[PDB]
Write an enzyme that holds these catalytic residues in place. Structure first.
Site, PDB file in Angstrom:
ATOM      1  N   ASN A 107       0.801  -1.218   0.000  1.00  0.00           N
ATOM      2  CA  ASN A 107       0.000   0.000   0.000  1.00  0.00           C
ATOM      3  C   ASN A 107       0.837   1.273   0.000  1.00  0.00           C
ATOM      4  OD1 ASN A 107       0.759  -0.846   2.657  1.00  0.00           O
ATOM      5  ND2 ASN A 107      -0.616   0.717   3.498  1.00  0.00           N
ATOM      6  N   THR A 157       8.536 -18.139 -31.088  1.00  0.00           N
ATOM      7  CA  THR A 157       7.107 -18.215 -30.843  1.00  0.00           C
ATOM      8  C   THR A 157       6.380 -18.561 -32.140  1.00  0.00           C
ATOM      9  OG1 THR A 157       7.364 -16.555 -29.108  1.00  0.00           O
ATOM     10  CG2 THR A 157       5.137 -16.985 -29.878  1.00  0.00           C
ATOM     11  N   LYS A 159       3.600 -18.009 -34.699  1.00  0.00           N
ATOM     12  CA  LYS A 159       2.787 -16.901 -35.163  1.00  0.00           C
ATOM     13  C   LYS A 159       1.826 -17.358 -36.256  1.00  0.00           C
ATOM     14  CE  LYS A 159       4.809 -14.077 -32.448  1.00  0.00           C
ATOM     15  NZ  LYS A 159       4.025 -14.052 -31.184  1.00  0.00           N
ATOM     16  N   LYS A 161      -0.281 -14.961 -33.277  1.00  0.00           N
ATOM     17  CA  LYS A 161      -0.478 -15.212 -31.854  1.00  0.00           C
ATOM     18  C   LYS A 161      -1.682 -16.105 -31.596  1.00  0.00           C
ATOM     19  CE  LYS A 161       0.264 -12.048 -29.048  1.00  0.00           C
ATOM     20  NZ  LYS A 161       0.214 -10.861 -28.155  1.00  0.00           N
ATOM     21  N   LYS A 185       7.666 -22.457 -28.921  1.00  0.00           N
ATOM     22  CA  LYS A 185       6.879 -22.197 -27.724  1.00  0.00           C
ATOM     23  C   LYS A 185       5.483 -21.691 -28.025  1.00  0.00           C
ATOM     24  CE  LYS A 185       7.515 -18.542 -25.483  1.00  0.00           C
ATOM     25  NZ  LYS A 185       6.479 -17.608 -25.792  1.00  0.00           N
ATOM     26  N   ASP A 187       2.326 -18.985 -27.382  1.00  0.00           N
ATOM     27  CA  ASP A 187       2.332 -17.562 -27.099  1.00  0.00           C
ATOM     28  C   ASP A 187       1.563 -17.288 -25.809  1.00  0.00           C
ATOM     29  OD1 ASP A 187       3.266 -15.073 -27.635  1.00  0.00           O
ATOM     30  OD2 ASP A 187       1.981 -14.689 -29.367  1.00  0.00           O
ATOM     31  N   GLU A 188       1.801 -16.106 -25.236  1.00  0.00           N
ATOM     32  CA  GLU A 188       1.312 -15.826 -23.889  1.00  0.00           C
ATOM     33  C   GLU A 188      -0.210 -15.830 -23.809  1.00  0.00           C
ATOM     34  OE1 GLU A 188       2.876 -13.248 -25.587  1.00  0.00           O
ATOM     35  OE2 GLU A 188       1.206 -11.849 -25.855  1.00  0.00           O
ATOM     36  N   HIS A 278       7.386 -16.856 -18.445  1.00  0.00           N
ATOM     37  CA  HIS A 278       7.198 -15.683 -19.284  1.00  0.00           C
ATOM     38  C   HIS A 278       6.787 -14.493 -18.429  1.00  0.00           C
ATOM     39  CE1 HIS A 278       5.149 -13.587 -22.933  1.00  0.00           C
ATOM     40  NE2 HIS A 278       6.416 -13.236 -22.823  1.00  0.00           N
ATOM     41  N   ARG A 279       7.369 -13.331 -18.728  1.00  0.00           N
ATOM     42  CA  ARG A 279       7.205 -12.133 -17.912  1.00  0.00           C
ATOM     43  C   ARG A 279       6.084 -11.229 -18.406  1.00  0.00           C
ATOM     44  NH1 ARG A 279      11.948  -7.764 -19.452  1.00  0.00           N
ATOM     45  NH2 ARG A 279      11.557  -7.765 -21.710  1.00  0.00           N
ATOM     46  N   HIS A 311      12.318 -13.823 -19.674  1.00  0.00           N
ATOM     47  CA  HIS A 311      12.657 -12.896 -20.743  1.00  0.00           C
ATOM     48  C   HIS A 311      13.339 -11.682 -20.129  1.00  0.00           C
ATOM     49  CE1 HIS A 311       9.880 -14.714 -23.952  1.00  0.00           C
ATOM     50  NE2 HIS A 311       9.844 -15.518 -22.904  1.00  0.00           N
ATOM     51  N   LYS A 318      11.899  -4.733 -30.579  1.00  0.00           N
ATOM     52  CA  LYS A 318      10.764  -3.819 -30.560  1.00  0.00           C
ATOM     53  C   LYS A 318      10.290  -3.488 -29.152  1.00  0.00           C
ATOM     54  CE  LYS A 318       7.386  -7.488 -30.805  1.00  0.00           C
ATOM     55  NZ  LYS A 318       6.040  -7.908 -31.276  1.00  0.00           N
ATOM     56  N   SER A 363      13.943 -12.422 -26.162  1.00  0.00           N
ATOM     57  CA  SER A 363      12.873 -12.437 -27.143  1.00  0.00           C
ATOM     58  C   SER A 363      12.482 -11.016 -27.529  1.00  0.00           C
ATOM     59  CB  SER A 363      11.650 -13.189 -26.611  1.00  0.00           C
ATOM     60  OG  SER A 363      10.507 -12.909 -27.396  1.00  0.00           O
TER      61      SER A 363
HETATM   62  O1  LIG Z   1       4.964 -11.122 -29.342  1.00  0.00           O
HETATM   63  C1  LIG Z   1       5.327 -11.797 -28.361  1.00  0.00           C
HETATM   64  O2  LIG Z   1       4.723 -11.873 -27.264  1.00  0.00           O
HETATM   65  C2  LIG Z   1       6.609 -12.616 -28.466  1.00  0.00           C
HETATM   66  O3  LIG Z   1       6.259 -13.924 -28.778  1.00  0.00           O
HETATM   67  C3  LIG Z   1       7.453 -11.962 -29.536  1.00  0.00           C
HETATM   68  O4  LIG Z   1       7.011 -12.402 -30.760  1.00  0.00           O
HETATM   69  P1  LIG Z   1       8.058 -11.855 -32.041  1.00  0.00           P
HETATM   70  O5  LIG Z   1       9.264 -12.731 -31.721  1.00  0.00           O
HETATM   71  O6  LIG Z   1       7.325 -12.134 -33.338  1.00  0.00           O
HETATM   72  O7  LIG Z   1       8.268 -10.386 -31.751  1.00  0.00           O
HETATM   73  C4  LIG Z   1       7.299 -12.558 -27.098  1.00  0.00           C
HETATM   74  O8  LIG Z   1       6.410 -12.985 -26.101  1.00  0.00           O
HETATM   75  C5  LIG Z   1       7.801 -11.127 -26.806  1.00  0.00           C
HETATM   76  O9  LIG Z   1       9.148 -10.939 -27.072  1.00  0.00           O
HETATM   77  C6  LIG Z   1       7.540 -10.820 -25.350  1.00  0.00           C
HETATM   78  O10 LIG Z   1       8.233  -9.665 -25.075  1.00  0.00           O
HETATM   79  P2  LIG Z   1       9.231  -9.884 -23.655  1.00  0.00           P
HETATM   80  O11 LIG Z   1      10.343 -10.701 -24.295  1.00  0.00           O
HETATM   81  O12 LIG Z   1       9.609  -8.494 -23.197  1.00  0.00           O
HETATM   82  O13 LIG Z   1       8.318 -10.665 -22.730  1.00  0.00           O
HETATM   83  O1  LIG Z   2      -2.714  -1.315   5.586  1.00  0.00           O
HETATM   84  C1  LIG Z   2      -3.123  -0.176   5.917  1.00  0.00           C
HETATM   85  O2  LIG Z   2      -2.424   0.853   5.983  1.00  0.00           O
HETATM   86  C2  LIG Z   2      -4.607  -0.087   6.274  1.00  0.00           C
HETATM   87  O3  LIG Z   2      -4.901  -1.131   7.144  1.00  0.00           O
HETATM   88  C3  LIG Z   2      -4.826   1.278   6.898  1.00  0.00           C
HETATM   89  O4  LIG Z   2      -4.744   1.152   8.266  1.00  0.00           O
HETATM   90  P1  LIG Z   2      -5.033   2.684   9.050  1.00  0.00           P
HETATM   91  O5  LIG Z   2      -6.550   2.724   8.901  1.00  0.00           O
HETATM   92  O6  LIG Z   2      -4.483   2.564  10.455  1.00  0.00           O
HETATM   93  O7  LIG Z   2      -4.296   3.681   8.182  1.00  0.00           O
HETATM   94  C4  LIG Z   2      -5.408  -0.235   4.969  1.00  0.00           C
HETATM   95  O8  LIG Z   2      -5.398  -1.574   4.556  1.00  0.00           O
HETATM   96  C5  LIG Z   2      -4.831   0.678   3.865  1.00  0.00           C
HETATM   97  O9  LIG Z   2      -5.345   1.966   3.874  1.00  0.00           O
HETATM   98  C6  LIG Z   2      -5.115   0.047   2.520  1.00  0.00           C
HETATM   99  O10 LIG Z   2      -5.239   1.096   1.637  1.00  0.00           O
HETATM  100  P2  LIG Z   2      -6.399   0.712   0.375  1.00  0.00           P
HETATM  101  O11 LIG Z   2      -7.430  -0.007   1.232  1.00  0.00           O
HETATM  102  O12 LIG Z   2      -6.832   2.045  -0.196  1.00  0.00           O
HETATM  103  O13 LIG Z   2      -5.604  -0.183  -0.554  1.00  0.00           O
HETATM  104 MG   LIG Z   3       4.651 -13.857 -26.742  1.00  0.00          MG
END
Ligand SMILES: O=C(O)[C@@](O)(COP(=O)(O)O)[C@H](O)[C@H](O)COP(=O)(O)O
Ligand SMILES: O=C(O)[C@@](O)(COP(=O)(O)O)[C@H](O)[C@H](O)COP(=O)(O)O
Ligand SMILES: [Mg+2]
Lengths: 447, 83, 90
Positions: A107, A157, A159, A161, A185, A187-188, A278-279, A311, A318, A363
């Protein structure tokens, strides 16, 4: 009955300790704060330290029920714009990233006092790091498993997708593996769609993987996507991939969540599977340089919980990326001790305490011309995923996968000879294209 | 970071189908959690009962809270500490 | 949940009625008073009337649960030293 001093008390009077020398068992954090006008840096750094710890916006009577100095976090240093906060070891539950990621980055990111807040790095102590399993197989055991050495393993990947039926999906997979790629692989966003369900896809693909593996005489694999809407379904798809004889499963470890990912990682190890992570959805965290969680934190979280690949992003593709920051991340997943490099986005010295390394997967939108850059950044221990650069070849996936394989072989072979890859990439690629017709078509189409 | 003084604004946004959480606004009472819980409970009911008779909350919030604190010691100590 | 003005108030402002006309059912007492130096004559007479009747030394909330003016006594005439007080028959 007993009286205390109630009232709103400024944070920096108990959560700011500039004379604090952290122990070796503390989670240090490096936040990049951007406070409100009129709110000082020191007081904002205390607000971040207090609310990711034992603090609150007032003074409560139950502060005297426990020794607060044993558990409170504190900002022990400020470097102008970066606040260093030291969290005690006792504040966190063993073997759970979901606890770090709900306390430190919970928070505190949405306060009215701070306009922007980015967690740059974090020091995992060996004491808290030991309670994690680490990657199931790592680098060396995986290289042995595939029987591939001394080169960056290829990939791609499938293609487009989405849209391909299960039958036509497996024919593209066969062409890529037979062409020369070491792995393909899913695709996501392709999990169990009506046009291509998962039981149909898992059975068809492993038929093409086995068929391609036999003819080409080398070990192949395909990162079948097992992520789904629930952990029970995710584990049910993992077992089916295991019984089919697969070597790999792929998981969206950020969209599926860390709890489900840790559940899948345990089940995957008991099935003898190698788990690619995969991220997807990381850019929402870490695109802007003023707010979010930098990927060198999400990469640390991955290695601890356990993940064979991630990744790290191509800095010439790109997708966004800094060459220096990627270099720090790449060596943050593979090396065992990473000394802090201020010129590389690294703040803390990270000892890994025997946890086994991780392949950095490169990738993106990378064609053959990017191979000289890619090899230098990562080296042998990496995956280069030419997803659209394979199927985009003028003569299909088989021709394209041959061009990518030749380009990687020629560049790596030149590196071992001694040539300077950065300055001679075009020369080496043209030397290879003098004898490889498939590379020549690709090298001029995308050049 | 809500307390008794924020009750008129909260009841005017969410209505009755909502939860109001007083974490530091309950234990932050200068005399304990039980006193703080009563201060927060009286504050909500006083505003809710005032809304049920047509009193404009966003105008008469402070008046309603003062009227309730006139006979509730807990709410009186809660507003004397905050705001 | 029922506001009243607490605190000490003088006996004079609620137990001295110079315009009061005694009834034929009231008990009239001719008290001879000698107040402390620093206490008004027309103030001590109110204290005697109040503390032989519903009054006391502080406004109590329960005064609102009775029609006090029906029962309370009140000094209605002062001749300097002797003060006349009228007590209702009830
Ligand atoms: O488009 C896609 O999602 C890809 O399959 C790329 O396809 P291309 O190889 O045709 O671009 C990969 O997941 C990306 O690189 C993910 O980016 P990151 O690596 O940052 O997760
Ligand atoms: O974790 C905390 O800080 C709290 O318990 C606040 O306690 P107090 O009431 O003692 O401040 C709440 O969960 C947060 O406000 C979450 O914010 P939101 O709910 O907007 O994600
Ligand atoms: Mg992908």
């Amino acid at each position: 009955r007993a009286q205390y001093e109630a009232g709103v008390r400024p944070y920096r009077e108990t959560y700011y300790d500039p004379d604090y020398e952290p122990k070796d068992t503390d989670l240090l954090c490096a936040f990049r704060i951007t406070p409100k006008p009129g709110v000082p840096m020191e007081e904002a750094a205390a607000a971040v330290a207090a609310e990711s710890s034992t603090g609150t916006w007032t003074e409560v009577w139950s502060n005297l029920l426990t020794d607060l100095e044993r558990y409170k976090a504190r900002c022990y240093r400020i470097e102008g714009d970066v606040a260093y906060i030291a969290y005690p070891l006792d504040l966190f539950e063993e073997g759970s990233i979901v606890n770090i990621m709900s306390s430190i980055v919970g928070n505190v990111f949405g306060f009215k006092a701070v306009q922007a807040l980015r967690l740059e790095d974090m020091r995992i102590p060996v004491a808290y790091l030991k309670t994690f399993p680490g990657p199931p197989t790592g680098i060396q055991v995986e290289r042995d498993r595939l029987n591939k050495y001394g080169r960056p393993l290829l990939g791609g990947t499938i293609k487009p997708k989405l849209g391909l039926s299960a039958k036509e999906y497996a024919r593209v997979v066969y062409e890529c593996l037979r062409g020369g790629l070491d792995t393909t692989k899913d695709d996501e966003n392709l999990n169990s769609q009506p046009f291509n369900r998962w039981r149909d896809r898992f059975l068809y693909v492993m038929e093409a993987v086995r068929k391609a593996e036999a003819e080409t005489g080398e070990r192949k694999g395909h990162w079948l996507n097992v992520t789904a809407g629930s952990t029970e379904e995710m584990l049910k798809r993992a077992e089916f991939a295991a019984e089919l004889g697969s070597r790999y499963i792929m998981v969206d470890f950020l969209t599926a969540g860390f709890a489900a990912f840790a559940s899948v990682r345990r089940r995957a190890e008991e099935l003898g599977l190698m788990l690619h992570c995969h991220r997807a959805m990381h850019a929402v965290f870490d695109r802007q340089p003023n707010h979010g969680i930098h990927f060198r934190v999400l990469a640390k979280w991955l290695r601890m919980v356990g993940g064979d690949h991630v990744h790290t992003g191509t800095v010439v593709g790109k997708l966004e990326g800094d060459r220096a920051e990627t270099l720090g991340i790449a060596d943050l997943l593979r090396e065992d001790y990473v000394p802090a490099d201020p010129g590389r986005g690294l703040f803390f010295d990270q000892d890994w305490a025997g946890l086994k390394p991780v392949f950095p997967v490169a990738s993106g939108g990378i064609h053959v011309w990017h191979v000289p850059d890619l090899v230098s950044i990562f080296g042998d221990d990496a995956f280069f995923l030419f997803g659209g650069g394979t199927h985009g070849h003028p003569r299909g996936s088989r021709a394209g996968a041959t061009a990518n394989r030749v380009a990687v072989e020629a560049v790596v072979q030149a590196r071992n000879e001694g040539r300077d890859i950065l300055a001679e990439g075009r020369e080496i690629l043209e030397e290879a294209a003098r004898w490889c017709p498939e590379l020549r078509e690709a090298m001029e189409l995308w050049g």
